[PDB]
Amino acid sequence: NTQELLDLLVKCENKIQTRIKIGLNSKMPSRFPPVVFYTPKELGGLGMLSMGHVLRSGMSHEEDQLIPNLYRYIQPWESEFIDSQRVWAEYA
Amino acid sequence: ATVRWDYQPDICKDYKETGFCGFGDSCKFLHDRSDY
Amino acid sequence: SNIYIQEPPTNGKVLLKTTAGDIDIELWSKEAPKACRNFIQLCLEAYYDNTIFHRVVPGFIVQGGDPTGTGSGGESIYGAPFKDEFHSRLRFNRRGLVAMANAGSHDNGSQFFFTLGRADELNNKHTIFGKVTGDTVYNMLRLSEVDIDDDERPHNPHKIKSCEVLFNPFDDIIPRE
Amino acid sequence: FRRTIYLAIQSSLDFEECAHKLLKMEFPESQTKELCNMILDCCAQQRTYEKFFGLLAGRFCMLKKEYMESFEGIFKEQYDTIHRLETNKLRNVAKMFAHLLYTDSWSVLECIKLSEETTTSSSRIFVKIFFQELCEYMGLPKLNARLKDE
Amino acid sequence: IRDVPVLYHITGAISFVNEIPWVIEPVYISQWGSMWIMMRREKRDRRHFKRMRFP
Amino acid sequence: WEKNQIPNRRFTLWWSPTINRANVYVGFQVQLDLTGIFMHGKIPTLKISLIQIFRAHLWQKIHESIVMDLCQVFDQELDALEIETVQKETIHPRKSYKMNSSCADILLFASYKWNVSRPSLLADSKDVMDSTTTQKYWIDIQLRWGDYDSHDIERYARAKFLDYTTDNMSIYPSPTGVLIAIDLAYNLHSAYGNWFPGSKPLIQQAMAKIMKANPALYVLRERIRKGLQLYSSEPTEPYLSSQNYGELFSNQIIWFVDDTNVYRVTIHKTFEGNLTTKPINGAIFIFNPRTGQLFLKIIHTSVWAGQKRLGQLAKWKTAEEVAALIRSLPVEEQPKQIIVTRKGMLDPLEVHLLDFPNIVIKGSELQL
Amino acid sequence: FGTVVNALGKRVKPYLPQICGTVLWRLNNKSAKVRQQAADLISRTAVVMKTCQEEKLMGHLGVVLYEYLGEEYPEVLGSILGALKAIVNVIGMHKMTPPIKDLLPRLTPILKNRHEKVQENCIDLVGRIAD
Amino acid sequence: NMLNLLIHRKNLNYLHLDYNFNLKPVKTLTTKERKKSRFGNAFHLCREVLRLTKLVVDSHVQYRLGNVDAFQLADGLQYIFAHVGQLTGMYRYKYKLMRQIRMCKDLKHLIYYRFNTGPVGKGPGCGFWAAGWRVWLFFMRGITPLLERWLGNLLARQFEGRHSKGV
Amino acid sequence: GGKDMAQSIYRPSKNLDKDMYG
Ligand SMILES: O=P(O)(O)O[C@H]1[C@H](OP(=O)(O)O)[C@@H](OP(=O)(O)O)[C@H](OP(=O)(O)O)[C@@H](OP(=O)(O)O)[C@H]1OP(=O)(O)O
Ligand SMILES: [Zn+2]
Prior knowledge:
9 chains, B: little secondary structure, 1 helix, 6% strand, C: Cyclophilin, 9-stranded antiparallel beta sheet, 2 helices, globular, binds inositol hexakisphosphate, binds zinc ion, splicing, spliceosome, cryo-EM structure, activated spliceosome, pre-mRNA splicing
């Protein structure tokens, strides 16, 4: 519910990725498709957790493609509260 | 696209000669030793 | 997908039938009209028939064009040694070149030689009037395979049996009788 | 089609965005059964109840008259698997239909029966939850109404 | 072939082209309109339009 | 993985095919010093780690050892191939990483004469040796470092061949020859050029062996492993042997064809007691290893009505249906090779695939 | 294993490629456990890999082992140097596939290495070659 | 000739300038050589502008030699001007140039779209340079005085000496 | 599950086989 956050996250992801770009010498997008940043380093990527490809267009995608968001995989506080109460009562 | 030889090596001269780099693991150069 | 090879396009073509096989020569008659005119007419005059190759330097040149076979002979169609002709676009970078032998400047006779390899020291010295076509190239090289006797002379020198002019760029050449 | 649905849904925050992403793609309509079958399975199979996957099934109904039908069907399709599904996912379902039925996407119920004759102890729990959720919204009085006219 | 006027230092060091390309506007436009047509037709018609290699 | 120093520097190698590309917006293509690698733009860390990979002239060592290996291979086959002699040219020292021109690595001198066919791919099959004849024959070995954009070896091979043959700068003793390109980066190998009887199988086998064998390549591969600090989890490796299936999935689309169940019959007894045979619905089995794609052709009994004996018809119809299936297939999916369970199928397929001459037909020493 | 092979003598020769194939593939695996062990296996199998005159195998072990000298785990590296040692005692000086000009200065910096086995085998090998 | 004279004037015998104006080094350089051999932007800018003109002129020369064709030549010229950033490297030394590059890319879109309208396809052959050619001339109009001032100083330092005072 | 699934991906034997076989 905070748009200002979403903006801040987007620009900040773009700043750290832009910095890693600086790290080698290029800013050239064709030389850093998201597969390098978002590959879990098990396969040799950087394993970057990315919340900023969400929608105005937040960030670029090479193809149509997609990226998953952290927020979708975390259970909301409200639900975990109700769940807590029910789980404890049932436990007793 | 025309091709230009890169002939400059990146070998660290301190480590190539002596075998010890003062910069340690942080060295910007090759650390490959003693080739001709 | 670009690999460039720069050379001006040739004009004229002459076939040499030798004991070493056929040799196709593409001539530059834009760059060397004088020596190519001389060569074409001397071929049409049967002047090169049964003329040996009297000088072979391994990996350098193989030399021929002397009717006497001694190497000091031969004459042009002009009644005198004619002028040398040079170009920055014609160089010796390779074997497969057909050039004019001389003892000096403006000395050009009827003698000519094939390049067995690179000669960078003959640059701006001998005129390059032609090149041997790739398909026939090996045959040229077989001219250079001999047991060589004293003074760079093969024991069994290869010969030019006949001559055919396949394409004549010159309109006005009249062979002498 | 089944894979594209998942990726579009896992990608999108909100429940609104997935429908937009999904409708936008303009995938073939008849499949508008199985797709929705996809959503009901995809989250319910997913580990714990989440508000998002239940909303999506419903909106997808209001946009086209068929989508509603597609759902009510899929609720029927449960009878066969009322026993069969394992005793977690009933915890996702009972509520999960609770939230379509509190918000009006009731009488479709009637098909469901109480008998020792045939009810799956599965099904027993399924319906059990379904009420212990829907109640918690309507608050057992509005539920008094909805039943009394049901 | 276009011939141009040239000033070259008596030494051979440098050649300058001493000229401004003035054109009659409606003529110029017409001529490149003509070229538009021609180039388009040529592209349509050649089976394979081989292009030069650089340098 | 390895469970202000290298780890950064390592991260570059792992993506180096992507980081460095033959297609970029703007760049000045540079050749690394003694190697054949082309950097686009200046990446210091990439440069460094690559220079680790190739050191003490490892590139030259690779080219050399490959050439030598071939030299020995032909030194064994002198008689079967009617070769008078085999000479390795003592190699111009810089020829390995010189990309503008190439000398000849090996010269095969024939005992009598060789009928030579038109230039085709190493993976090609159908050729006509009636094209020409010659004696001298040359072999050239090309090493390139691939990338993401062009890893394709074959187009590269035929390209360099056409160029070096049609250029006046490159020196070859005979127009008849072949060019072998091996991409180190992707460990790929292909060839394009002229052929003579017996040469194609020998070269295929020799390359397939070397790619598994040559110590130099193993030094390269190991250095890559160390620079990447990759280490395998499982000992003994999966069941690799020399078996052709590991290299068989590869890039090349390749199929397995099984006709055994195409012709099936059921027997029942009449009132005379004579056992009578009624054929039943058959099917053609076609499978793709890499995609798991199963083409199952259901052959109805309507095919079996009136024609003579059923077995040979099962065979020839089988080859037919395979041919038409490949016909309806897009070119990008077409098989580079077709392997057969029952060697009896080799004859009809070879006929019915004439419309697609580059498809290899191989029988299985491996029952499946 | 060593006793088995040295006892079999050259009856073992047909079995080498299987051996050393296993030796390299294991020579990777997962590091700290088995590297040292496969290395030592080489060390004790040196003479057998020599007298039967398989030279390619000596090329293999020579440069392959040469490459691991940058290994950061000491308990491995020690076994590596040991293997090199045993390889030196079979094939001679001037025939070393990693010519000593390469090898020795590559050894020189390692002497800082603290942990024991490295220092042991290292100093030993510097001793064999220096002598 | 100018650029070689500069190179020799400073005794940089380990550099090599080829004919399409690529400045290369003969051998791997020593530290000291690397210091001394750097050229600044003035020299490199000049070099790259010359490279551009050599591309152009060469194109005409091949037309005159009868190696090419009028239509092919026209297409080549359009190519050259649209692709300066990938044939030259001018930008390296002046990044502002990107402003011309973008113009050329846009005009190539524009013209190519209209030109390839009907039967005509995506193929290589469109000549219609006039636009791209303009753009480089505007560039040159401005950059000229800059290079005069910068090369002027370069020459003056070379001949007069780097000023001692650093006053 | 390469390193997760087991200490060894492969062990052979028919011991269990010829025991449970009967
Ligand atoms: O169709 P073509 O005549 O071959 O034109 C292509 C192509 O244009 P289209 O793809 O729009 O047909 C490229 O487009 P992309 O591949 O990049 O989508 C374009 O690339 P730009 O978008 O960078 O212009 C490329 O130029 P380049 O190969 O440098 O990328 C250009 O051909 P030219 O190279 O002939 O301009
Ligand atoms: Zn250093």
